[PDB]
Design a protein around this ligand. Sequence first.
Ligand SMILES: Nc1cc(CSc2ncc[nH]2)c2nc(N)[nH]c(=O)c2c1
Ligand SMILES: Nc1cc(CSc2ncc[nH]2)c2nc(N)[nH]c(=O)c2c1
Ligand SMILES: [Zn+2]
Ligand SMILES: [Zn+2]
Lengths: 366, 366
Amino acid sequence: RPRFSFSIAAREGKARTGTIEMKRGVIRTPAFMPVGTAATVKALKPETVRATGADIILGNTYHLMLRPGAERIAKLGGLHSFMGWDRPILTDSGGYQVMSLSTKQSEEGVTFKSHRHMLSPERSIEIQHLLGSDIVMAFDECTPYPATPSRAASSMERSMRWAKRSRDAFDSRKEQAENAALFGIQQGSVFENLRQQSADALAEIGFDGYAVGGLAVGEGQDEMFRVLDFSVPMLPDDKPHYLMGVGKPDDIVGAVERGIDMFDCVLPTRSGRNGQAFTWDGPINIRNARFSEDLKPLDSECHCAVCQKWSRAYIHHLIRAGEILGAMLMTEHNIAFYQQLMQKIRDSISEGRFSQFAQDFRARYF
Amino acid sequence: RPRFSFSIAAREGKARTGTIEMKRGVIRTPAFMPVGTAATVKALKPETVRATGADIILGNTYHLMLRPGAERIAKLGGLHSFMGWDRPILTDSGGYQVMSLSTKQSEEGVTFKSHRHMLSPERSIEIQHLLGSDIVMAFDECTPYPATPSRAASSMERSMRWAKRSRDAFDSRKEQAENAALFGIQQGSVFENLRQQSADALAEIGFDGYAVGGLAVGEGQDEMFRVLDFSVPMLPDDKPHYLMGVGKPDDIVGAVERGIDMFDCVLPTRSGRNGQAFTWDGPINIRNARFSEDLKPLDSECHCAVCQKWSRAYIHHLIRAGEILGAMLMTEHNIAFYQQLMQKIRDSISEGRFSQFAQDFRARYF
Ligand SMILES: Nc1cc(CSc2ncc[nH]2)c2nc(N)[nH]c(=O)c2c1
Ligand SMILES: Nc1cc(CSc2ncc[nH]2)c2nc(N)[nH]c(=O)c2c1
Ligand SMILES: [Zn+2]
Ligand SMILES: [Zn+2]
């Protein structure tokens, strides 16, 4: 396969379905990327992650640079070898968790004290290289919501300067430039003019893919959809569109209807461990006493291994008992559910019936 | 298969190797039974437990009678269906955890307040029936160590009376008597005469198997081996000998050399989650900094899936990071290691070279 090749096979309205070919494998879009925090998709072996249908996973950088360390992982052979996942891995720049998990910001980057460290566009790119990331994210500054036009502009402008620095750092490292891909991140809060300026700056620089950043920060789905309506069309049409940190099932369907090709979210994994299981009839909290003697599987249609073998009653017991198998089962089901959702989305778009699928999905889910 | 059939295929000294045929499957002896607390072998799916080589698992009763409840599990179809393990399951009587996890004792049984409940020989047997246990343990009273001859005798005598009551309760339930097996438990602390009286009482009553109880309570391996030396020969030779709660690798080898056919211990699972991994060169604590960049597998010879795919460095990272996958991997390896040990024991006995294997094992393990 090539270093990077995004091909759109079918479209319906603003929605698209296709593939991203990379050296480590093919990614079917729209795609959902399970999040691996600390070199592991919580409670799941890599083979299980793959079994659910995942083509690519997201690797948390901020966490890895602290422990076990970027240099160490490189010494041990890279993240893929380290955790046992040989397919594509997208790594975030760490420019988000730093300003939320641990700090002094400047035009040069961000220094912080782990929950004494410096992180700049150059170091972020280097860390992603050391990890062996397939899709590298430019180092940006996620703008807090709400944000005044002035602060949003300043932040967006700095992110664009950092986007240029990320680009050059990436290109200056031959091994990385030839084997990995680089995505730029659009900022600008909820303001149309800032989103346009950001989109133009990113396109001027040139990237393999474009992410829509700064959303899913507490603005509400209505507002998020409104911003996506005018923001996604600003990005290059022939490159992947990645909505960072968005994962609620209904959020995903609506985002795809607006042109998004890639997603990532900790919801399926985090919620799974918390007792929330996704079903086509909406999410359910398995801890609820009503499930103590329910012999049905988590979801009546789900084809995952958990729904083929265990009942809601058993998982209910496991979770309330605090058993590790509870987290394992809930997580496998949730991630499988998300992948099945992406497959249904891909299929409906390919068949020109996505709009109908979107409406049917909402009617039953809500 | 028959309800119960123990056949000895080969012997060397006091050691024996053979099979126990039951309706739900065949058990190879000497056998090691992974312990499932709360209807689950911690951090492992049933298929993984089976993949390691386990033929039977032990189900904790005391825990199950409290949550989710014996009646409830029966209503849901039994423990096998509930947790997804269709092979044999041995259940303890609960007469141990009660006097240690939560109490008023009397000749009728034990009443306790969960960490208001009554537990008698009759109820214990009924609970094991409701769970669908294949091998039912008589309800006894584990004698605390150290114990004076008088207290040990009183406890042993009560256990023998309870053994008769367990026998009758079991036989009076047609479904249970025809499909499950019942094991009696020898008590008597470290005293030879009490062990003899207990053995004679149990044989007089008649059981499908005989467990050596009251050991592994803080007496030390030397003392345990001394008691086994004179205690196991007292039990019927043509029935299985089960040493309850003994699991250290070296403990197992020594016990088999003394006539034991069955074992159970939480060590492999509990220790696994704590960072201890068993290897042929002795146990290692994976949390130790010396393993931070060790690319070798947990054990150089182990054929388990964990040692085929992940390094000590990765597991070291997982455990120190508190990741669920760390517990999963450590546990699968430890249980697989134990099963490989049992296989090596079975093979050496069948080939008349167990004594040599025992010596070689000790030399390298220590
Ligand atoms: N919402 C959101 C989420 C993420 C992290 S991806 C992730 N989210 C949750 C887990 N992982 C973002 N990352 C960057 N770099 N920039 C952003 O604007 C941004 C916005
Ligand atoms: N050592 C020991 C362990 C167990 C529990 S089996 C188990 N041990 C640890 C987990 N499961 C025992 N159980 C009974 N009923 N009687 C005994 O004398 C006795 C002695
Ligand atoms: Zn499912
Ligand atoms: Zn192993």
